């Protein structure tokens, strides 16, 4: 294998219950020849991805942690959200999504799709339930800043009258959800709720399901999941 | 300019403010030739260390995060503890350590030593058993009665001059440590040094021990107070929102 | 008054202590200063309902039912017992008001309130119970409840109970988030416009189980009271 | 119903999730007429068994807590120990006991006997001599050297066919028990069943003995382990409050 693939295999011999190892134990646990193992370990120690600890064994290095922390804002949210999204999938059996607002555009970070989903997945801020929910919680400037500019009816059901949007956004803000019938397919609706962290809306959790399906049960499931994401983000320490 | 050194330089072009870049921009910022950059970035995408979006751009990937989470308790503790450990060093001017308990073994995560330290640390590679350090005793004191009695059914070698070995003495010592919030270990690592440890909590659970090593005759209680203040600082910072 | 069944039952229980675990029915007459005939009646009824226990050897002891009855309110009772000396220390230093409170069914129950004679600020003179968003204590407790519980509370109207009471749900989310990270909250003007309230959490086994709070003049420095309350809170935690 | 039974019924309307009640609520839950609930509650308040809460309602009083605590040494241990003793009963199906030292004699705080128990357990008339039970010998092993020597200063009676009386044999017995963490022999009184005892600790000190009685033919070692696990469980529960 490439150097990098071997490095990853070495890293995957470590776990929360196995902090410190010898290079030989690494070799066995990664199924790497002893001499390859020692060489790969030594290169990893040189660049600080591993460190040689107080006990003579190697352990994961501070530099790996520091490097990973450079993406913590998106990566930690994604990693914490995913178990809650799985739970949503088990109950709804359609599609669940996680989204954030980045440079006044909606960036979808994760989507799950159930093999039995009836609805189908397919973008500007006004053209998804997620974007609408996020827009509803953005600053007053960002609302105006986006409403003045172009609002194409991107799908069949896409609301794009500046004044229809103000009422839609204001209701979403009060109610803690927004629905978006026919925004992607006329036969499908999108439902989004906010995810809070430290008092601010940082993301939106959404479902796509058939238009005819009841909306309120999905709002409840998404809320519960959004509450769980917040709890785990807030309570987690590492 | 090894493969791994190159991978690291690519990762370091990212930061809290730069979350998405093209392979070209990465080549410039990491001083890589653009052919090398495209190849390196592509290999990192292939193992999941980077993720390439639909619109061409590359971001730090879930697999990097998940690999770091294989040691995230130890690593984050070290990071948060270090500034508090440095302040202990300025005031006490001996040694300050951080340790955790893994499968009833004591792992030391950091050991700082002041250039003017009178006491001496063991500088040989190895691992003391759980009963043979102040950190081990503090950690054992919070491990619960089941773990205690397991340890006390097993061999208790008298490793150093001061090492307490009598099962009943150890039960009293551990109970006292639990109530008092510190343990002292006079003469365990050398005859002329004492170890002093306090607990570090997260969410009510004792997850580590902060310790000093200092000369045998130095007063224990002034050092305990310093360690306690540092432990409070560590506990407080561990619950800061932004990592 | 001294002559009811209950008053006599209590006087009997008080003859027992850590050293006097086992007595006789007549020796209880002696130490409680009751006539033996009336003593043997009260004991027998106490033994019947299980407040005392007696073996074949005549010996009477405090019974398991007494213990189980007391346990029905143990957290609150034990917390008060432990907290009181630390609160008196706060009273000496701040010379205003110190309170201890718990959350039950998302309502704040004040368990203890000490007011110093020279206190410049005034406590609330509302007879019934303030809601959870209407005191520093309720804010501190709510900050440690689930986001679930937070969003339940914030889904209902929040009256402006005092001059300064924050009722805006977004301002509340920000206030609560900050309180959670900082380990205290302030509630300026919640009782009177010239006073504030400050609370810190009390933990047991990792869970915030109560709030220790002050009321003091609005103009006074906040941070010194926060530290005093913090020292008291740590003392209370040690002792539990 | 008597005054004291009503008082008790009032106390039983409280619980860990209901600490403050109106007297009318108390009447509802205790099945008392409104007039009766009021006067029962009022007198309970008057003597401090209840307290009238800071915001109007009634709650369990500090006085009740202080009264309960006068026997917490026995009562808390018993309350905490009982579920672990029931788990021993389920696995061994004989007899489990809980004992402490009172005035240098063995006081049994709890005894459980299983219906299907093969062995027979002697009916106990008060406290037993400290040297005449496995529980006694286990507690004595962890008492002071002062306590040990006081017991051994006076010649000891042969209370049963199993009783050891010789001071030197007792010293060896006690040293072995202290070191091994159990006493196991024929019953030191009847000696037709095996009495087994292990220490229960709290905060570094042996506070009680957990014991079994079982037939002479049964293996000792598995019952020692089961009792040890229970003793560790009891200690654990005492430390988590």
């Amino acid at each position: 294998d490439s150097m990098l693939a071997r490095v990853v295999r070495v890293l995957e011999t470590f776990n929360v219950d196995r902090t410190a190892q010898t290079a030989s134990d690494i070799g066995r646990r990664a199924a790497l020849p002893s001499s390859t193992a020692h060489r790969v370990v030594d290169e990893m120690v040189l660049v600080g991805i591993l460190e040689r600890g107080i006990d003579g064994k190697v352990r994961l290095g501070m530099r790996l942690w520091e490097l990973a922390l450079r993406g913590s804002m998106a990566l930690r949210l994604r990693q914490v959200a995913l178990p809650h999204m799985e739970r949503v999938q088990q109950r709804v059996r359609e599609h669940t999504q996680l989204a954030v607002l980045e440079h006044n555009e909606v960036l979808f970070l994760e989507r799950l799709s159930h093999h039995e989903a009836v609805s189908n997945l397919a973008l500007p801020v006004h053209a998804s339930s997620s974007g609408l929910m996020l827009l509803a919680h953005a600053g007053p400037e960002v609302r105006e800043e986006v409403l003045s500019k172009p609002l194409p009816r991107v799908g069949p059901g896409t609301v794009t009258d500046p004044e229809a949007l103000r009422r839609l956004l204001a209701n979403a803000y009060r109610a803690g959800y927004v629905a978006a019938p026919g925004y992607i397919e006329a036969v499908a609706t999108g439902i989004a709720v906010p995810i809070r962290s430290e008092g601010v809306v940082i993301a939106a959790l959404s479902a796509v399901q058939p238009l005819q399906n009841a909306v309120e049960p999905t709002v409840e499931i998404l809320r519960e999941a959004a509450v769980g994401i917040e709890t785990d983000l807030r309570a987690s320490r590492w």
Side-chain angles (χ1 to χ4, degrees), chain A residues 66-79:
Chain A
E66 285 162 359
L67 289 169
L69 283 178
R70 292 162 182 265
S72 68
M73 206 199 32
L75 296 168
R76 192 162 165 245
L77 169 63
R78 289 164 64 185
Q79 171 262 302

Side-chain angles (χ1 to χ4, degrees), chain A residues 39-60:
Chain A
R39 293 177 337 83
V40 179
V41 166
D42 286 348
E43 270 284 290
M44 290 165 76
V45 174
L46 193 67
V47 304
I49 287 176
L50 302 177
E51 292 163 9
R52 293 211 157 82
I54 286 85
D55 64 351
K57 290 159 163 195
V58 291
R59 44 194 80 180
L60 302 175

Side-chain angles (χ1 to χ4, degrees), chain A residues 177-207:
Chain A
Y177 74 98
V178 51
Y183 271 51
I184 295 302
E185 289 188 355
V187 72
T189 179
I191 301 159
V193 305
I195 294 163
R196 296 193 153 86
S197 180
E198 313 309 300
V200 44
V201 177
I202 59 152
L205 196 72
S206 65

Side-chain angles (χ1 to χ4, degrees), chain A residues 13-63:
Chain A
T13 67
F14 289 94
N15 58 75
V16 299
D17 300 315
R18 191 184 288 270
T19 296
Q21 309 182 85
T22 64
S24 296
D25 286 338
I26 286 166
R28 315 200 202 283
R29 286 165 62 74
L32 279 171
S34 199
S35 53
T36 310
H38 279 80
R39 293 177 337 83
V40 179
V41 166
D42 286 348
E43 270 284 290
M44 290 165 76
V45 174
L46 193 67
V47 304
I49 287 176
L50 302 177
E51 292 163 9
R52 293 211 157 82
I54 286 85
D55 64 351
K57 290 159 163 195
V58 291
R59 44 194 80 180
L60 302 175
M62 188 54 54
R63 198 184 195 177

Side-chain angles (χ1 to χ4, degrees), chain A residues 74-152:
Chain A
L75 296 168
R76 192 162 165 245
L77 169 63
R78 289 164 64 185
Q79 171 262 302
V80 169
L82 280 164
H84 294 285
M85 296 173 75
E86 287 175 57
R87 206 160 285 125
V88 172
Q89 291 296 109
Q90 288 167 24
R91 290 264 285 288
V92 181
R93 305 188 281 276
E94 293 286 326
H95 311 268
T96 308
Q97 321 169 108
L98 176 70
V100 305
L101 198 58
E102 193 174 278
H103 302 152
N104 303 331
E105 264 185 341
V106 179
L107 191 77
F108 287 93
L109 301 174
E110 300 294 350
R111 307 198 215 223
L112 299 188
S113 295
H114 202 273
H115 47 285
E116 293 165 348
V118 175
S119 66
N120 293 306
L121 292 173
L123 206 83
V125 175
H126 71 275
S128 58
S129 67
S130 289
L132 287 169
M133 180 49 67
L134 291 157
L135 192 59
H137 289 273
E141 345 82 51
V142 177
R143 245 85 56 73
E144 304 298 18
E145 181 165 29
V146 166
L147 267 32
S148 57
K149 311 218 180 203
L151 324 180

